[PDB]
Design a protein around this ligand. Structure first.
Ligand code: PXN
Ligand code: ZN
Ligand code: ZN
Ligand code: ZN
Length: 422
């Protein structure tokens, strides 16, 4: 029974802090006068950084761990990736989905992630993965709050019975309504699909998260419809546009006009840097575009944007350990957010901003909130990011659910010396 966390650093704060726990909540946060000694019922942060848990705002748990089955994505494009998935989706079973989803979820728990939004392909008359994932959500609840997006991978209007399947997924309990307007057969189907998505979200009172303009096409502007509909319904906080990689290729005048609406609408954005850098720019020769959405500009404008991993060893991405600091590292480089302050504040892109994207209410290190928090063996966000630190402890409801004993490196020169890379 933990009653206290001691010797903790907090972002943007001086010295050490003591975090008092009570009934699985944070009761108080008090400054320390110095390093406190270990005591029974206390957890020693060892002068590490305490932050709320990492969030994964965008992952595909139904496809995770399937790379190469039955074939590899040779071109490394979104479009072949969908072809490869269709082959694998025909082989999906209930147990298959749950086994693979849980494998990745365990990596996530180990990585201090306590909030996850997974998209699940509902372009499937049997709804096999969706129904399986609704079970996983209940099973993993003690460790991760999992949101499920009903994601119509092959289109709402462009797939047989797509709209009916999407609605059935909501009836069954999916938390979020998805869409994919740039993959619909026509621009008109794309726009109409968004009207249907918003209608369903209002009917069932659910969140929205659209796979939006994931394509190097300067004419793909479905994001403006997502934002306009959100604004009209007054529901911006409940709405997310994922990817928006087309925005990387927009002219600046249109982008300027668009940003006014994006800010007024209050919708959220997810960028997926590991996957975006891999899949975008594939139809360029040289020079080759980066293909990530306008993260730096969004931040400058106070538009909420955050980072997701998207894919973990699957048709779209052959790598990954579900690590959010690694995602952040890629995002900072590709988006050129490389100022000291920008790097130090980078933690926000995988914590607070992502919590806002998931519409979370019980999140943050504050008295009254659930005792959900993680401890990094690092002095601040910059240090954590530079050294790619593991999660020392993950605490949920005041209980430790994960811990990492950090690696220990020694060099043998004239005498043994410990190396910490600081
Ligand atoms: C994926 C690999 O690491 C093994 O996990 C087994 C697991 C067992 O199900 C537990 C559930 C509460 O009934 C998940 O383990 C989490 C427990 C220990 O809390 C899921 O296995 C899925 C198969 C059996 O279709
Ligand atoms: Zn079942
Ligand atoms: Zn993806
Ligand atoms: Zn996705």
């Amino acid at each position: 029974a933990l009653q206290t966390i001691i010797n903790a650093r907090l972002p943007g704060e001086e010295g050490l802090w003591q975090i008092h726990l009570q009934d699985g909540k944070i009761s108080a946060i008090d400054a320390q006068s110095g390093v406190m000694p270990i005591t029974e019922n206390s957890l020693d942060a060892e002068q590490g950084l305490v932050i709320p848990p990492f969030v994964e705002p965008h992952i595909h748990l139904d496809t995770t761990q399937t790379a190469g089955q039955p074939n590899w994505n040779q071109s490394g494009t979104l479009f072949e990736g969908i072809e490869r998935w269709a082959e694998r989706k025909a082989l999906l079973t209930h147990d298959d989905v749950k086994q693979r989803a849980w494998q990745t979820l365990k990596w996530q728990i180990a990585n201090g992630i306590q909030h996850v939004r997974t998209h699940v392909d509902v372009s499937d008359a049997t709804l096999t993965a969706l129904k399986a994932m609704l079970e996983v959500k209940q099973e993993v609840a003690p460790w991760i709050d999992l949101q499920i997006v009903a994601f119509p991978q092959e289109g709402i209007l462009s797939y047989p019975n797509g709209e009916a399947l999407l609605e059935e997924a909501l009836r069954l309990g999916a938390d979020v309504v998805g869409a994919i307007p740039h993959f619909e057969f026509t621009r008109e189907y794309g726009v109409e699909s968004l009207h249907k998505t918003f209608a369903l979200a209002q009917k069932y009172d659910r969140l929205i998260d659209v796979h939006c303009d994931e394509i190097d096409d300067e004419q793909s502007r479905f994001v403006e419809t997502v934002a306009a509909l959100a604004h009209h319904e007054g529901m911006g906080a409940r709405v997310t546009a994922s990817h928006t990689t087309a925005m990387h290729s927009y002219n600046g005048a249109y982008t300027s006009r668009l940003f006014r609406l994006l800010k007024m609408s209050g919708i959220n954005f997810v960028a997926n840097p590991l996957v975006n850098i891999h899949l975008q720019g594939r139809f360029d020769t040289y020079p080759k575009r980066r293909g990530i959405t306008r993260v730096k500009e969004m931040l400058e404008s106070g538009i909420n944007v955050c980072f997701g991993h998207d894919d973990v060893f699957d048709p779209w991405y052959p790598l990954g350990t579900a690590n959010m600091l690694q995602v952040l590292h890629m995002g900072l480089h590709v988006c050129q957010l490389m100022g000291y302050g920008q790097i130090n504040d980078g933690l926000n892109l995988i914590t607070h901003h992502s919590a806002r994207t998931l519409n979370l209410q019980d999140y943050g290190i504050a008295a009254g909130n659930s005792a959900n928090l993680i401890i990094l063996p690092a002095e601040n966000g910059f240090d954590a990011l530079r050294r790619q630190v593991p999660v020392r402890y993950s605490v949920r409801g005041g209980k430790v659910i994960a811990s990492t004993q950090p690696a220990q490196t020694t060099v043998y020169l004239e005498q043994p010396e410990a190396i910490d890379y600081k």
